[PDB]
């Protein structure tokens, strides 16, 4: 208003915006409801190794005690611990969960995993394998119907044994390989050849028993080589479709949208006009261009690597503008692991 | 707020257009929704009316 | 499908496919043998 | 009026209109009247998994408890639960029912299903199969006269067993496949190859026992393959006529009119003139053009895909205009599943 004479001043209305990167690793673990040597509190929050020792002063032998001791020993960070009846509540609240691992629970865990997928929370679990010693005489399929088929998760069979103490479920071994990966070099690279320390596998599998379990589903054995030892081996998800294999290409799309959806919550109820459309289009591709130089998604002439478009008649025509909708679409081509390396000799 | 509203009955109250005061964890209380009463495509929005 | 204003997330799903080749080998033999265990009597067995 | 001098102002009389999309999945279930471990309230309304647990704290073994636990575990939403004597009341009130499934009730359910079809409520039920083990020696027809022949419904035989607990009636298994279909990619695609999780079929059927039950009626078996598992198989309705087969082509016409009939309730008692006829004709085809680019109904030159016409002498001549009637007709060609794929080799 301009009621009285004098010196008035106004400032800018709106400023720029951009997305903040990630967290990339916050797991919740699988407590057991019938367990005794533990607290009756369902949800615990642990931040580092310090308070875990003052809460649990004695070294135990249970599967959860051997799992968190393997998480923190390879780095690790803020990790939760919930009972196996309250996953569907704990994911919908804490707003930062990435991994649902199974610390030796199978039956009631697979139902609570596919529950929070059904609402579309964009999460990535990972499961256990069978207990001991597939004989390898026959039956390649009947050990694989007890696992929920979905593009979220792997199984990690061979059951490392932790020669210091008792056995370790392999979800903890797989979760430790992701921690020293995203801290070292990105999330688009597979938790594939980074070695773990202090864990030996109980079995020696083969070179060819990997072969018959590489199609259909994704056993993803844990095999020890000469030189580098006790390393993980194979990064494959449960389906075999040419869009959704290769666990790192799933986690790339899984973490490239949880930072855009987190940022655009302060841009709703904004006027659906022309200066909005040229500002979101100029803010998204400035995040992808920072992601293309880092080697996350492959392609020259970076108009070929991705595309962003938003407008008035290419998308969201006039009648659905009157309903308030503001629809966009972006598409990008990620990288894939070089799982097979073949090389040809000739004479020329 | 006096009564805590959740998202599953937000779906019912956002048609028959009435607005809602929401509670969030990080930023506290906030107003939510900007729809007027009668719901033809002539004027369904507060600013287009105002 | 959309009631609370919020922000919604959505992906395009498609069965887009390609074809890769297998091997033309590894037969089975139907001669007589002497198995060592009774479950190896009349079922197909993979030999590496 | 123009009584006194001064500045008057008027505004616009009528504005534009368009249709709102859909809901596509609100089921009501089949309670049992003689059941004891339950509430005597006939009509319950459940919205998600939270209040279902506080109402039913103990895990039970009844057919309805195993059905809703399979609905919510694959996503799901707002679902009702009515006794088997009050379907004819609950559909006529709540104005959003789409599916009538049978949770292990056959005798009194088939009468209440065909009741609300008789008034033309445009609904699509789905039924159970026979109990166990067609021997396959003979008799292809005598298991199929106890089912009401109508273009609404299927049977879904093999009675999945839910290896965690007790048996599951297959109406719940079929209803879970529709939920992750319309959320993923439209309603015009059949609930056909999207896999379910945590349910194994009790039987292994055949490759050819599907064959003799594919004509006449539509057994639509549930068969497990290698790789993808426990998937549904076959989308066929009860008749074999070349207009009404293929369950997705029924649900396409079933949901393309429940949004036009919902919208035109605010356009009755409007003057039947020339500016009305050019406005409904320009509002319907702007909804079909949004539906043609999405791949719902097939055809190039989109004047060939549908047609809309409304006028004074092509339809609704002068005498039935004096009675108030305003009749239109629109016609469109949908898509159909590629149930059979044959391929021919040659040499040229």
PDB file of N, CA, C and O in Angstrom, chain A residues 28-44 46 56 62-65 67-68 80-87 100-106 108-109:
ATOM      1  N   UNK A  28      17.789 -50.086   8.567  1.00  0.00           N
ATOM      2  CA  UNK A  28      17.095 -50.612   9.734  1.00  0.00           C
ATOM      3  C   UNK A  28      17.237 -52.126   9.724  1.00  0.00           C
ATOM      4  O   UNK A  28      17.198 -52.753   8.660  1.00  0.00           O
ATOM      5  N   UNK A  29      17.410 -52.715  10.900  1.00  0.00           N
ATOM      6  CA  UNK A  29      17.797 -54.112  11.005  1.00  0.00           C
ATOM      7  C   UNK A  29      16.600 -54.951  11.446  1.00  0.00           C
ATOM      8  O   UNK A  29      15.509 -54.436  11.709  1.00  0.00           O
ATOM      9  N   UNK A  30      16.814 -56.262  11.526  1.00  0.00           N
ATOM     10  CA  UNK A  30      15.745 -57.219  11.806  1.00  0.00           C
ATOM     11  C   UNK A  30      15.946 -57.791  13.206  1.00  0.00           C
ATOM     12  O   UNK A  30      16.679 -58.762  13.399  1.00  0.00           O
ATOM     13  N   UNK A  31      15.289 -57.178  14.186  1.00  0.00           N
ATOM     14  CA  UNK A  31      15.219 -57.742  15.523  1.00  0.00           C
ATOM     15  C   UNK A  31      14.303 -58.968  15.517  1.00  0.00           C
ATOM     16  O   UNK A  31      13.558 -59.214  14.563  1.00  0.00           O
ATOM     17  N   UNK A  32      14.360 -59.753  16.592  1.00  0.00           N
ATOM     18  CA  UNK A  32      13.504 -60.924  16.746  1.00  0.00           C
ATOM     19  C   UNK A  32      12.590 -60.728  17.947  1.00  0.00           C
ATOM     20  O   UNK A  32      13.061 -60.377  19.034  1.00  0.00           O
ATOM     21  N   UNK A  33      11.296 -60.997  17.762  1.00  0.00           N
ATOM     22  CA  UNK A  33      10.331 -60.651  18.801  1.00  0.00           C
ATOM     23  C   UNK A  33      10.412 -61.593  19.996  1.00  0.00           C
ATOM     24  O   UNK A  33      10.189 -61.164  21.134  1.00  0.00           O
ATOM     25  N   UNK A  34      10.728 -62.867  19.765  1.00  0.00           N
ATOM     26  CA  UNK A  34      10.783 -63.855  20.834  1.00  0.00           C
ATOM     27  C   UNK A  34      12.110 -63.857  21.584  1.00  0.00           C
ATOM     28  O   UNK A  34      12.308 -64.711  22.456  1.00  0.00           O
ATOM     29  N   UNK A  35      13.015 -62.933  21.278  1.00  0.00           N
ATOM     30  CA  UNK A  35      14.346 -62.963  21.863  1.00  0.00           C
ATOM     31  C   UNK A  35      14.326 -62.427  23.290  1.00  0.00           C
ATOM     32  O   UNK A  35      13.532 -61.550  23.638  1.00  0.00           O
ATOM     33  N   UNK A  36      15.215 -62.970  24.119  1.00  0.00           N
ATOM     34  CA  UNK A  36      15.200 -62.718  25.555  1.00  0.00           C
ATOM     35  C   UNK A  36      16.315 -61.794  26.015  1.00  0.00           C
ATOM     36  O   UNK A  36      16.070 -60.885  26.811  1.00  0.00           O
ATOM     37  N   UNK A  37      17.543 -62.002  25.532  1.00  0.00           N
ATOM     38  CA  UNK A  37      18.708 -61.256  26.007  1.00  0.00           C
ATOM     39  C   UNK A  37      18.788 -59.892  25.315  1.00  0.00           C
ATOM     40  O   UNK A  37      19.727 -59.577  24.587  1.00  0.00           O
ATOM     41  N   UNK A  38      17.774 -59.073  25.574  1.00  0.00           N
ATOM     42  CA  UNK A  38      17.565 -57.833  24.832  1.00  0.00           C
ATOM     43  C   UNK A  38      16.507 -57.015  25.566  1.00  0.00           C
ATOM     44  O   UNK A  38      15.944 -57.452  26.574  1.00  0.00           O
ATOM     45  N   UNK A  39      16.244 -55.822  25.047  1.00  0.00           N
ATOM     46  CA  UNK A  39      15.277 -54.902  25.631  1.00  0.00           C
ATOM     47  C   UNK A  39      13.925 -55.135  24.971  1.00  0.00           C
ATOM     48  O   UNK A  39      13.837 -55.448  23.778  1.00  0.00           O
ATOM     49  N   UNK A  40      12.858 -54.980  25.754  1.00  0.00           N
ATOM     50  CA  UNK A  40      11.498 -55.067  25.240  1.00  0.00           C
ATOM     51  C   UNK A  40      11.074 -53.836  24.448  1.00  0.00           C
ATOM     52  O   UNK A  40       9.950 -53.812  23.931  1.00  0.00           O
ATOM     53  N   UNK A  41      11.926 -52.826  24.341  1.00  0.00           N
ATOM     54  CA  UNK A  41      11.607 -51.672  23.510  1.00  0.00           C
ATOM     55  C   UNK A  41      11.685 -52.065  22.039  1.00  0.00           C
ATOM     56  O   UNK A  41      12.700 -52.620  21.603  1.00  0.00           O
ATOM     57  N   UNK A  42      10.643 -51.803  21.250  1.00  0.00           N
ATOM     58  CA  UNK A  42      10.654 -52.233  19.844  1.00  0.00           C
ATOM     59  C   UNK A  42      11.650 -51.472  18.985  1.00  0.00           C
ATOM     60  O   UNK A  42      12.401 -52.078  18.214  1.00  0.00           O
ATOM     61  N   UNK A  43      11.672 -50.147  19.108  1.00  0.00           N
ATOM     62  CA  UNK A  43      12.469 -49.286  18.241  1.00  0.00           C
ATOM     63  C   UNK A  43      13.622 -48.710  19.051  1.00  0.00           C
ATOM     64  O   UNK A  43      13.403 -47.981  20.027  1.00  0.00           O
ATOM     65  N   UNK A  44      14.845 -49.037  18.645  1.00  0.00           N
ATOM     66  CA  UNK A  44      16.051 -48.428  19.187  1.00  0.00           C
ATOM     67  C   UNK A  44      16.744 -47.630  18.091  1.00  0.00           C
ATOM     68  O   UNK A  44      16.666 -47.972  16.906  1.00  0.00           O
ATOM     69  N   UNK A  46      20.553 -46.210  17.225  1.00  0.00           N
ATOM     70  CA  UNK A  46      21.976 -46.232  17.525  1.00  0.00           C
ATOM     71  C   UNK A  46      22.707 -45.351  16.521  1.00  0.00           C
ATOM     72  O   UNK A  46      22.421 -45.401  15.321  1.00  0.00           O
ATOM     73  N   UNK A  56      24.908 -52.765  25.604  1.00  0.00           N
ATOM     74  CA  UNK A  56      25.191 -54.199  25.565  1.00  0.00           C
ATOM     75  C   UNK A  56      26.612 -54.410  26.071  1.00  0.00           C
ATOM     76  O   UNK A  56      27.568 -54.419  25.279  1.00  0.00           O
ATOM     77  N   UNK A  62      24.073 -63.925  19.586  1.00  0.00           N
ATOM     78  CA  UNK A  62      22.868 -63.873  18.777  1.00  0.00           C
ATOM     79  C   UNK A  62      23.152 -63.203  17.435  1.00  0.00           C
ATOM     80  O   UNK A  62      24.165 -62.521  17.250  1.00  0.00           O
ATOM     81  N   UNK A  63      22.235 -63.412  16.488  1.00  0.00           N
ATOM     82  CA  UNK A  63      22.474 -62.993  15.112  1.00  0.00           C
ATOM     83  C   UNK A  63      22.495 -61.475  14.967  1.00  0.00           C
ATOM     84  O   UNK A  63      23.190 -60.952  14.089  1.00  0.00           O
ATOM     85  N   UNK A  64      21.749 -60.752  15.807  1.00  0.00           N
ATOM     86  CA  UNK A  64      21.771 -59.296  15.717  1.00  0.00           C
ATOM     87  C   UNK A  64      23.039 -58.707  16.322  1.00  0.00           C
ATOM     88  O   UNK A  64      23.533 -57.686  15.835  1.00  0.00           O
ATOM     89  N   UNK A  65      23.582 -59.333  17.369  1.00  0.00           N
ATOM     90  CA  UNK A  65      24.807 -58.819  17.975  1.00  0.00           C
ATOM     91  C   UNK A  65      25.995 -58.995  17.040  1.00  0.00           C
ATOM     92  O   UNK A  65      26.890 -58.143  16.995  1.00  0.00           O
ATOM     93  N   UNK A  67      25.697 -58.869  13.866  1.00  0.00           N
ATOM     94  CA  UNK A  67      25.420 -58.085  12.669  1.00  0.00           C
ATOM     95  C   UNK A  67      25.820 -56.625  12.846  1.00  0.00           C
ATOM     96  O   UNK A  67      26.451 -56.042  11.958  1.00  0.00           O
ATOM     97  N   UNK A  68      25.461 -56.014  13.981  1.00  0.00           N
ATOM     98  CA  UNK A  68      25.832 -54.618  14.189  1.00  0.00           C
ATOM     99  C   UNK A  68      27.324 -54.470  14.454  1.00  0.00           C
ATOM    100  O   UNK A  68      27.915 -53.445  14.103  1.00  0.00           O
ATOM    101  N   UNK A  80      19.315 -48.040  12.601  1.00  0.00           N
ATOM    102  CA  UNK A  80      18.185 -48.289  13.478  1.00  0.00           C
ATOM    103  C   UNK A  80      18.081 -49.782  13.786  1.00  0.00           C
ATOM    104  O   UNK A  80      18.821 -50.611  13.250  1.00  0.00           O
ATOM    105  N   UNK A  81      17.141 -50.126  14.667  1.00  0.00           N
ATOM    106  CA  UNK A  81      16.905 -51.520  15.032  1.00  0.00           C
ATOM    107  C   UNK A  81      15.457 -51.650  15.482  1.00  0.00           C
ATOM    108  O   UNK A  81      15.108 -51.210  16.583  1.00  0.00           O
ATOM    109  N   UNK A  82      14.619 -52.250  14.640  1.00  0.00           N
ATOM    110  CA  UNK A  82      13.189 -52.358  14.897  1.00  0.00           C
ATOM    111  C   UNK A  82      12.806 -53.831  14.919  1.00  0.00           C
ATOM    112  O   UNK A  82      13.451 -54.668  14.281  1.00  0.00           O
ATOM    113  N   UNK A  83      11.747 -54.143  15.662  1.00  0.00           N
ATOM    114  CA  UNK A  83      11.221 -55.497  15.666  1.00  0.00           C
ATOM    115  C   UNK A  83      10.529 -55.805  14.340  1.00  0.00           C
ATOM    116  O   UNK A  83      10.220 -54.915  13.542  1.00  0.00           O
ATOM    117  N   UNK A  84      10.281 -57.093  14.107  1.00  0.00           N
ATOM    118  CA  UNK A  84       9.815 -57.552  12.807  1.00  0.00           C
ATOM    119  C   UNK A  84       8.303 -57.439  12.642  1.00  0.00           C
ATOM    120  O   UNK A  84       7.761 -57.981  11.673  1.00  0.00           O
ATOM    121  N   UNK A  85       7.614 -56.752  13.552  1.00  0.00           N
ATOM    122  CA  UNK A  85       6.204 -56.435  13.380  1.00  0.00           C
ATOM    123  C   UNK A  85       5.934 -54.968  13.081  1.00  0.00           C
ATOM    124  O   UNK A  85       4.779 -54.613  12.822  1.00  0.00           O
ATOM    125  N   UNK A  86       6.954 -54.109  13.106  1.00  0.00           N
ATOM    126  CA  UNK A  86       6.745 -52.668  12.997  1.00  0.00           C
ATOM    127  C   UNK A  86       7.638 -52.041  11.930  1.00  0.00           C
ATOM    128  O   UNK A  86       8.074 -50.897  12.077  1.00  0.00           O
ATOM    129  N   UNK A  87       7.921 -52.773  10.850  1.00  0.00           N
ATOM    130  CA  UNK A  87       8.600 -52.151   9.717  1.00  0.00           C
ATOM    131  C   UNK A  87       7.663 -51.194   8.995  1.00  0.00           C
ATOM    132  O   UNK A  87       8.069 -50.106   8.568  1.00  0.00           O
ATOM    133  N   UNK A 100      16.567 -52.381   3.972  1.00  0.00           N
ATOM    134  CA  UNK A 100      15.916 -53.312   4.892  1.00  0.00           C
ATOM    135  C   UNK A 100      16.659 -54.638   4.782  1.00  0.00           C
ATOM    136  O   UNK A 100      16.444 -55.399   3.831  1.00  0.00           O
ATOM    137  N   UNK A 101      17.534 -54.921   5.739  1.00  0.00           N
ATOM    138  CA  UNK A 101      18.282 -56.167   5.745  1.00  0.00           C
ATOM    139  C   UNK A 101      17.602 -57.137   6.703  1.00  0.00           C
ATOM    140  O   UNK A 101      16.816 -56.750   7.573  1.00  0.00           O
ATOM    141  N   UNK A 102      17.906 -58.422   6.540  1.00  0.00           N
ATOM    142  CA  UNK A 102      17.335 -59.484   7.363  1.00  0.00           C
ATOM    143  C   UNK A 102      18.448 -60.134   8.172  1.00  0.00           C
ATOM    144  O   UNK A 102      19.329 -60.789   7.606  1.00  0.00           O
ATOM    145  N   UNK A 103      18.413 -59.956   9.492  1.00  0.00           N
ATOM    146  CA  UNK A 103      19.403 -60.568  10.375  1.00  0.00           C
ATOM    147  C   UNK A 103      18.903 -61.928  10.865  1.00  0.00           C
ATOM    148  O   UNK A 103      18.669 -62.161  12.050  1.00  0.00           O
ATOM    149  N   UNK A 104      18.741 -62.837   9.907  1.00  0.00           N
ATOM    150  CA  UNK A 104      18.347 -64.198  10.212  1.00  0.00           C
ATOM    151  C   UNK A 104      16.861 -64.384  10.409  1.00  0.00           C
ATOM    152  O   UNK A 104      16.446 -65.291  11.138  1.00  0.00           O
ATOM    153  N   UNK A 105      16.041 -63.549   9.776  1.00  0.00           N
ATOM    154  CA  UNK A 105      14.593 -63.695   9.770  1.00  0.00           C
ATOM    155  C   UNK A 105      14.102 -63.747   8.331  1.00  0.00           C
ATOM    156  O   UNK A 105      14.510 -62.925   7.504  1.00  0.00           O
ATOM    157  N   UNK A 106      13.234 -64.707   8.034  1.00  0.00           N
ATOM    158  CA  UNK A 106      12.734 -64.885   6.677  1.00  0.00           C
ATOM    159  C   UNK A 106      11.218 -64.843   6.577  1.00  0.00           C
ATOM    160  O   UNK A 106      10.686 -64.232   5.647  1.00  0.00           O
ATOM    161  N   UNK A 108       8.246 -63.841   8.450  1.00  0.00           N
ATOM    162  CA  UNK A 108       7.469 -62.620   8.627  1.00  0.00           C
ATOM    163  C   UNK A 108       8.164 -61.373   8.093  1.00  0.00           C
ATOM    164  O   UNK A 108       7.561 -60.297   8.113  1.00  0.00           O
ATOM    165  N   UNK A 109       9.407 -61.484   7.620  1.00  0.00           N
ATOM    166  CA  UNK A 109      10.086 -60.317   7.065  1.00  0.00           C
ATOM    167  C   UNK A 109       9.669 -60.041   5.627  1.00  0.00           C
ATOM    168  O   UNK A 109       9.574 -58.874   5.227  1.00  0.00           O
TER     169      UNK A 109
END
